[PDB]
Amino acid sequence: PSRTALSPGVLSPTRPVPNWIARPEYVGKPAAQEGSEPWVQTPEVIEKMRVAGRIAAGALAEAGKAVAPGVTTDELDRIAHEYLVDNGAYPSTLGYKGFPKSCCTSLNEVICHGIPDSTVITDGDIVNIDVTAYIGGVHGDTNATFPAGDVADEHRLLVDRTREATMRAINTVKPGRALSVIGRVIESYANRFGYNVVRDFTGHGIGTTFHNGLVVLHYDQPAVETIMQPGMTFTIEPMINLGALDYEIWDDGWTVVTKDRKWTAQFEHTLLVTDTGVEILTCL
Numbered sequence: 690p691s692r693t694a695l696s697p698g699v700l701s702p703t704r705p706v707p708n709w710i711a712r713p714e715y716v717g718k719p720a721a722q723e724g725s726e727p728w729v730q731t732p733e734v735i736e737k738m739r740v741a742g743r744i745a746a747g748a749l750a751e752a753g754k755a756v757a758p759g760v761t762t763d764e765l766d767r768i769a770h771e772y773l774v775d776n777g778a779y780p781s782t783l784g785y786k787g788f789p790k791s792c793c794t795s796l797n798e799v800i801c802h803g804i805p806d807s808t809v810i811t812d813g814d815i816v817n818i819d820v821t822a823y824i825g826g827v828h829g830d831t832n833a834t835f836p837a838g839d840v841a842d843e844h845r846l847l848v849d850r851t852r853e854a855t856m857r858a859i860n861t862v863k864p865g866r867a868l869s870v871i872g873r874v875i876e877s878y879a880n881r882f883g884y885n886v887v888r889d890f891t892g893h894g895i896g897t898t899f900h901n902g903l904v905v906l907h908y909d910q911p912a913v914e915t916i917m918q919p920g921m922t923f924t925i926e927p928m929i930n931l932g933a934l935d936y937e938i939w940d941d942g943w944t945v946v947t948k949d950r951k952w953t954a955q956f957e958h959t960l961l962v963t964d965t966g967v968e969i970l971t972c973l
């Protein structure tokens with residue numbers, strides 16, 4: 690047997706960032722200045738995004754190594770926060786439209802945007818950790834779902850198939866392909882198992898802004914005309930549900946849970962379209 694439905698816990702104090710680490714412009718403001726930027730980045734931006742991606746990937750790996758029964762989602766946050774700040778990076782989630790921590794921790798039925806808190810991880814849980822780094826004036830965004838102890842076969846299979854769906858989507862990325870192939874591949878694959886692909890939350894262009902206005906759908910919609918072009922940078926971050934798509938948002942305004950409380954899994958990379966294919970920027 691697995692855990693029953695989650696409830697929100699209490700937050701730890703806001704974690705400090707040394708002043709020499711530049712903040713993204715949106716910290717503490719009600720909105721963010723993003724959504725109207727070009728989608729193909731300059732070479733100088735791309736090189737800085739390889740640095741930001743690798744530091745985010747390090748933070749996600751360190752916190753992922755800590756996922757185990759008995760560890761709280763707040764403890765994960767502490768590890769991601771400390772890794773980012775000790776690398777001179779600002780945690781892009783911290784202060785984004787009031788979000789109060791340095792990564793998102795989404796267990797079980799939480800589709801996305803769970804807030805690290807006093808929740809204790811237990812055996813059987815699946816734990817998504819999503820960390821973004823801001824450094825060099827650019828962002829790098831990556832996430833993965835980690836099993837805690839021995840996870841039930843249907844939950845294990847959902848995690849592993851969601852990882853596969855993400856890899857197959859990444860492997861489609863090539864200049865000249867329609868962006869819509871990403872969702873086509875993910876949804877076709879997911880539907881083989883009777884899973885449902887979340888529609889209202891998507892991937893996104895990323896560069897000097899966190900969500901740059903480019904939207905990357907994870908379901909099939911070939912009416913989107915956008916093509917992949919060298920220099921384009923975006924995330925692929927499918928959330929795939931065992932149950933129905935209907936969801937609710939907790940009173941914190943952030944935590945998104947499945948209404949039927951069936952579990953859901955996600956993985957994410959920041960990608961660069963190169964002249965021949967793809968380069969994963971959030972790579973160790």
Ligand SMILES: CO[C@@H](C(=O)NC1Cc2ccccc2C1)[C@H](O)[C@@H](O)[C@H](O)/C=C/C(C)(C)C
Nearest residue numbers: 782785788801802819821889890891892893904
């Ligand atoms: C799933 O989550 C992604 C997400 O909300 N996409 C948006 C959902 C959406 C809906 C319509 C149009 C664009 C987009 C991009 C998001 O980009 C995460 O990967 C990121 O790490 C977290 C950001 C905070 C918690 C600070 C918000």
Ligand code: NI
Nearest residue numbers: 819830831832
């Ligand atoms: Ni993310």
Ligand code: NI
Nearest residue numbers: 830924926957
């Ligand atoms: Ni993202």
